[PDB]
Design a protein that fits this description.
Chains A, B, C, D: Keywords: Hydrolase, Plasmid. Chains A, B, C, D: GO terms for molecular function: 1,4-dihydroxy-2-naphthoyl-CoA thioesterase activity; 4-hydroxybenzoyl-CoA thioesterase activity. The structure is a homotetramer. Chain A is of the alpha+beta class and about 140 residues long. Chain A is about 20% helix and about 40% strand. Chain A has a single domain, classed as Hotdog Thioesterase (Thiol Ester Dehydrase, Chain A, Roll). Chain A has 2 helices and 6 strands. Chain A is globular, with a radius of gyration of 15 Å. At the A-B interface, helix 1, helix 2 and strand 3 of A face helix 1, helix 2 and strand 3 of B. Strand 3 of chain C pairs antiparallel with strand 3 of chain D. Bound molecules: 4-hydroxyphenacyl coenzyme A (4 copies). One 4-hydroxyphenacyl coenzyme A (4CO) sits at the interface of chains C and D.
């Protein structure tokens, strides 16, 4: 579901039940250095003024950047979790899709850093989100 | 109606269909300088690893900081929208609630800044979110 | 005069006495969309542990992003100032130079956003700095 | 010099020669949870338009937050270095002093997080800076 990296035999929460399944995030491409994902805008993505919620751009960036890290480190016995997210909002999105492209810009032993651009259907850059992903050894 | 500030007679999206109403955000207190909100953790707030989604903390902080700005400025002919958000994640939340407390730290003519704390049922500080809120004349 | 954009006949502080001239920042290229600058590492750029000061990367990014905004908007009656800066530090620099490359990513009516990369003499990416630049009518 | 924590018998760079000594940063109070410092504004602190440089607020926050961490962890065999700094600029400072107050808001095993308020001589809040400080075991 959502085409998230398949790194474990089971997961605590089914895709369709998570925030990500609820709003409809879907991953398209995914490599160690770059990953893309998108979502259809519907009310569930919007806030009361009719624009895509700022939290939705943060949430798509976070899932994409974290899972793109999980895709690499999980089989190395590590876990990956968001430690910091900085999002800037340049243009509202009223409808259509949001498309996210994540580029890896640093991969340290304790911290990976991704830049995520969020664009509307015309290709305009509506938001960007910088994420720092902590990598730590798994607890079992 | 999540108890959001009732500033207009019509809104483009009803509470219950917004991302906010979908995950269950509810505002408890609101004054010009300070506001609080909370949410019950359910799967809809979680990611597949069973923890509250990073985007959920961002979304809660975004709605609370923005709407507490709306509450003041709307009657002044102004629109308020999120311009930037920086969220840092200190401890995960697996279940219970997330409680948010937004404190206004600067109210400029064009920009309001709010610090938002996010705490678990034990009161521990699990994340913080700084929100910068652009304030502009409402377009006809 | 650090090669900063020559937009006015007088400036309140001469280059050589500013923080910029004190540490030795010099702009190499400037266009509306992209600009570069660099500095020689000396003790004046370092902290007591012998590494380049975190504030130095921030200062370089701040001067480069702002003044590249000044270069466009000054002749339009506008002032440009730093509104927010987020800097992330990936590898220390002990000696040599720091080279900065600022790329404009959004140019709004009130806000320009620039991403700045900071690299060592080996070309490695040592820090990044996102700058948000407020653009306002110049006060008489 | 500058009243920085005295944790080692020698340091790679003398205070008066560092960025911090050059601009005149001085620490006043310092405890595990809170630390204050200040600096006299002079041209060396300013940029060409006559206001305190954005980099100077970042640099005072960074030195104060990092050294406040060093004060605690150094005798535990750890080093502390800035990993991320997010600074927002609310009001310019033309002259007098900048006074920084750093409050610790989270102390993890790998990351300490400090909020630093920067005020002018009238007490007005002119900038804030959030820092994440990485703590790692020393390399010898
Ligand atoms: C933050 C962090 C330690 C995270 O490490 P990481 O993400 O785990 O990366 P990794 O550990 O993969 O190693 C990356 C590089 O970091 C350095 N590093 C990592 N761990 C250590 C360590 N325990 N000891 C020394 N260097 C280390 C080292 O350069 C390493 O390269 P290599 O020697 O292994 O090739 C690393 O990214 C880093 O060092 N970043 C740069 C930190 C920096 O230079 N910050 C700016 C200075 S902020 C401090 C400041 O301004 C200040 C001012 C005044 C004052 O009085 C005090 C402080
Ligand atoms: C960013 C902004 C303009 C936003 O304005 P706002 O949030 O709407 O606040 P508001 O407009 O309510 O006014 C707040 C104060 O800002 C100043 N200000 C605001 N608008 C203006 C304007 N159009 N013209 C002049 N001052 C203004 C003024 O001090 C005002 O106080 P008051 O005189 O109105 O009482 C305001 O918060 C601000 O001025 N912040 C401080 C900016 C600052 O000092 N940044 C760092 C330095 S500039 C970046 C830099 O380091 C650099 C380095 C080297 C170099 O070569 C060039 C630049
Ligand atoms: C922040 C700002 C207003 C700054 O404006 P700027 O940097 O000067 O850009 P500029 O003014 O050049 O205009 C860019 C676009 O912004 C929009 N915009 C700018 N000013 C205005 C205005 N006064 N009125 C309406 N739209 C405006 C408009 O789309 C404009 O495009 P155009 O129609 O002019 O072609 C603009 O960049 C912006 O609109 N960014 C997007 C803001 C956004 O979508 N944020 C997240 C959602 S709102 C936060 C939230 O999640 C929330 C959640 C729950 C809740 O209950 C309430 C809120
Ligand atoms: C980031 C970090 C690991 C840094 O750890 P630290 O600063 O070293 O703190 P310390 O390690 O002192 O321990 C703090 C707590 O962190 C947790 N933690 C630390 N290390 C680990 C670890 N190796 N394994 C599990 N938990 C850990 C643990 O809760 C610990 O408490 P305790 O069990 O020891 O009492 C910790 O601060 C943390 O876990 N922060 C919260 C991370 C978080 O919840 N982020 C939000 C989610 S972002 C991810 C996301 O949204 C996503 C969405 C969709 C999707 O498909 C995937 C991901």
């Amino acid at each position: 579901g959502g085409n998230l990296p398949d790194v474990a035999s089971h997961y605590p929460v089914a895709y369709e039940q998570t925030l990500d399944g609820t709003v409809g995030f879907v991953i398209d491409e995914m490599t160690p250095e770059r990953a893309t994902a998108s979502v259809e805008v519907t009310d569930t993505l919007r806030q009361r003024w009719g624009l895509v919620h700022g939290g939705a751009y943060c949430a798509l960036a976070q899932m994409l950047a974290t899972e793109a890290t999980v895709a690499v480190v999980h089989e190395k016995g590590m876990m990956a979790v968001g430690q910091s997210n900085h999002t800037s909002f340049f243009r509202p999105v009223k409808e259509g899709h949001v498309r996210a492209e994540a580029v890896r810009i640093h991969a340290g032993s304790t911290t990976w850093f991704w830049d995520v651009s969020l664009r509307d259907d015309a290709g305009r850059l509506c938001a960007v989100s910088s994420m720092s992903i902590a990598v730590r050894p798994r607890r079992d």
